[PDB]
Design an enzyme around this catalytic site. Sequence first.
Site, PDB file in Angstrom:
ATOM      1  N   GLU A 109       9.007  32.296  14.540  1.00 52.32           N
ATOM      2  CA  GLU A 109       8.031  32.698  13.515  1.00 52.32           C
ATOM      3  C   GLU A 109       7.069  31.583  13.111  1.00 52.32           C
ATOM      4  O   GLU A 109       5.887  31.854  12.923  1.00 52.32           O
ATOM      5  CB  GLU A 109       8.704  33.280  12.283  1.00 52.32           C
ATOM      6  CG  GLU A 109       9.397  34.611  12.539  1.00 52.32           C
ATOM      7  CD  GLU A 109      10.207  35.119  11.358  1.00 52.32           C
ATOM      8  OE1 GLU A 109      10.680  36.270  11.437  1.00 52.32           O
ATOM      9  OE2 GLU A 109      10.375  34.392  10.351  1.00 52.32           O
ATOM     10  N   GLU A 149      15.913  35.226   2.715  1.00 49.06           N
ATOM     11  CA  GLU A 149      15.186  36.441   3.147  1.00 49.06           C
ATOM     12  C   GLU A 149      15.598  36.985   4.526  1.00 49.06           C
ATOM     13  O   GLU A 149      15.745  38.199   4.691  1.00 49.06           O
ATOM     14  CB  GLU A 149      13.668  36.224   3.100  1.00 49.06           C
ATOM     15  CG  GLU A 149      12.872  37.514   2.929  1.00 49.06           C
ATOM     16  CD  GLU A 149      11.413  37.379   3.312  1.00 49.06           C
ATOM     17  OE1 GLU A 149      10.633  36.881   2.492  1.00 49.06           O
ATOM     18  OE2 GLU A 149      11.002  37.984   4.308  1.00 49.06           O
TER      19      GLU A 149
END
Lengths: 446, 60, 423, 53
Positions: free
Chosen positions: A137, A60
Amino acid sequence: TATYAQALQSVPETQVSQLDNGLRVASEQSSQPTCTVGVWIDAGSRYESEKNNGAGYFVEHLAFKGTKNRPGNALEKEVESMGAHLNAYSTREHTAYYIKALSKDLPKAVELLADIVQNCSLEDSQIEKERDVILQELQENDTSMRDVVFNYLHATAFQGTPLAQSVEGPSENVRKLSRADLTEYLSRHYKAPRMVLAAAGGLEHRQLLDLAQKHFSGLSGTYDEDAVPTLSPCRFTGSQICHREDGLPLAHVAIAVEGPGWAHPDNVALQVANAIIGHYDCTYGGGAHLSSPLASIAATNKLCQSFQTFNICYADTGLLGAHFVCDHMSIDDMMFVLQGQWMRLCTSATESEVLRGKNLLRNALVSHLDGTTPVCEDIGRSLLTYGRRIPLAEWESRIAEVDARVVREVCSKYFYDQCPAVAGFGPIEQLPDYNRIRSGMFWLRF
Amino acid sequence: APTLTARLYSLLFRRTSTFALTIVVGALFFERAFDQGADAIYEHINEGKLWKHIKHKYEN
Amino acid sequence: VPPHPQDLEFTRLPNGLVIASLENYAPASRIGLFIKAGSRYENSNNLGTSHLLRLASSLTTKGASSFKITRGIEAVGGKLSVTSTRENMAYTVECLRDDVDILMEFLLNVTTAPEFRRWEVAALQPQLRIDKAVALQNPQAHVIENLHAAAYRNALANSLYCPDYRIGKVTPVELHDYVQNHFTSARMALIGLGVSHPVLKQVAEQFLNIRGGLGLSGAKAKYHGGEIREQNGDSLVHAALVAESAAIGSAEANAFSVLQHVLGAGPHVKRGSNATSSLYQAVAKGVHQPFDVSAFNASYSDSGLFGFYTISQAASAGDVIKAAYNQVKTIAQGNLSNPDVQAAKNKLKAGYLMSVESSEGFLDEVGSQALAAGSYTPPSTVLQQIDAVADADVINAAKKFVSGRKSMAASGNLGHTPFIDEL
Amino acid sequence: MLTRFLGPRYRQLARNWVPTASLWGAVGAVGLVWATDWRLILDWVPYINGKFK
């Protein structure tokens, strides 16, 4: 002027074709000058092993950052120049890549999606850059008490199974996933029978099919080939995880019983029931006057900052229950009222409230499926899970069938005298002992 | 081919009403069966009680 | 084949009320009442009244109780919402097709027959504190609120959220006074989606014939310029730098909107480098830390604000602002290719058409249009209006920014954030 | 004043609790019969005839 019933019939049929590939190509035609186009893949963290875990999420991060035909930023430059939006997500079961574009830009949008999904560069310098991005993240996700409890709920409910794993994976996996690990993921998983090309808006189906034959030809058309797994079933465990952290100003609790899968017809009646309990937030109008007895009492007695019902579905299993956020002195009361509502619905659901639950679902479904993007997502996801698009009239027939007897039978099957999975994060000293949670799953008067 | 514990649960243990009904029917039948055995065990141990009383009755 | 779409139907009444409807043969209906009643219509004596009004929509009315509104809407699975800008309040109502009449009646009672009972008003006052606290947990909300107070003498200066000193102090009479002054036929637009035009027209003539309010659309927003500075120590500096631009509906506003997309609004790609974003690339050249930049564009009835917004590390705030300011200066000086304007026009056109995809976005667009312009403009004429912006118009808009008296708002650790002065 | 509890919701709530109320009645009756060794009923239960003569 038309009825609700007539209006559902007037919603146009989802057209489906299959390529020689195995790649399904599916569309809902509307009047709109704009479209959503995308690729839905049967791939996520449920397909990954302990060593593999986080690979799909890593993919991704690389998917938009260069292909063989458009290197580096060249894809970005093309999407931006046409005024298009390019997006992605990975759940436990499903990966998606989609473009919001002008309808006239559907040929290049399909062209770019094919280039992403087949011909991703994975340049070694890019993989290294993304390593640090993913780790940050993780540091970010850590501050989201909601994301944490839901990861904990999966990790305790599904314990020894691949559904226990987060999407993003552990930090050690992030730091040691090679190019070869990712290439192997893409080879095994990004196969044409496991992927769907979906569109909604101002397009003909024929045109979408033609572009599918142009750009998606020769993914699988001599290959497919040996070693696949199907998904093994995931054992649910009645269990508790308690991350006690008194430094944190509000407690997060998530509680679920074992749902059935995606496929199962009694998802509809469970959702009727969940709508009756509803959701709440401290910014709602209506304290005392809200229909849901949980919402009403939580507002009146200040029990709550928020709660939500959920029915998370996977293949052949689910998470069915509720999440809430509250003060340290309010956890015991919130649980008592939550469980009392489950017990009330199991034993003694009346008809008027079931109608309210039905109507809320009818409104939720039609409100959701509004825009090219949610309709496109619905095409892509439905063909993966159900194999068909289940039309709005069918959902209506399934909702209409549900009465009070259906609510009380279906609730009893999943809630009554069942072992919940519990996740708690924060100032959680007043979180009831598991035995006392378990005892809330039945009534002595019944 | 489903279990007997599973059937005893499904039919009887799930509702607290039937669970209580099982115990009370259970207790009446148990009281009979336990007393009958526990007398007969005590009776077999002993044999100088009114085992003898054939001697002295029925003459009346 | 779908059904070939119906056209929008549009009616101005002699009293000045606009009615607009579309029959998209959809399972759900949407009704909005749009009112020229946003926070700009507050003065010094009644600040936060429109906040408390926005929070008061399920309170007791002449035709339905508080309890009835909440239960009757929820029984049919409906929604009642109030959306406020500085110019407009928008009372929206969603339900299934068959349920429009009950939702209409509730809508009419909220907006034309509210009671503002002293005890229900009193019980509501702590909701101001909650609603504000939730909104002001985004640093952007405090910045944009300070930005307007810095910019304006007047009216657009007003906060969307109630001033703290006013919490507990907004009276039943002030709420009654606000509705009477502002919820009138000349200041109002009734918008319907998936209802017939005769049913809306009947509702409007029967129930929305009110006037003893105010003459229209402002005190006039006096642009002033200046700065507000909020020390926070907040890890990241949020800054906004602005000048007076163009009023909505002027051709000049369209030049500002294109300029915005040259410079760069939001992202298009999940996790992308924002390659075609002029501001982003200019900051990225000399700043190697985490940051954000965006062009800011706020257009109103009688004023506008244009410039840019920066999120950066405390120490990098000055560098980021100055890099961004210089990139606009480059465009004002005439360094702008025709491909750049054409890409930016494409982003605008796609962005707008996507903005009107949902029922929600279409109804807000139709409602605002009806208030601002007194007309409906179809997508193809919006697109024609965008197309008519020359390169020179974009340059001129950038020139007006550079030469214009500035407004600035900043929150964070401000030891390295400059002072208009220093730009 | 107890007109309050008359209406279709309250009838449905009566219907839902009636198998439970009658099963509790069954618990109570068998419970009282057992605890008093009650004569009339327990002569008629075909095992548990431990009076005989």
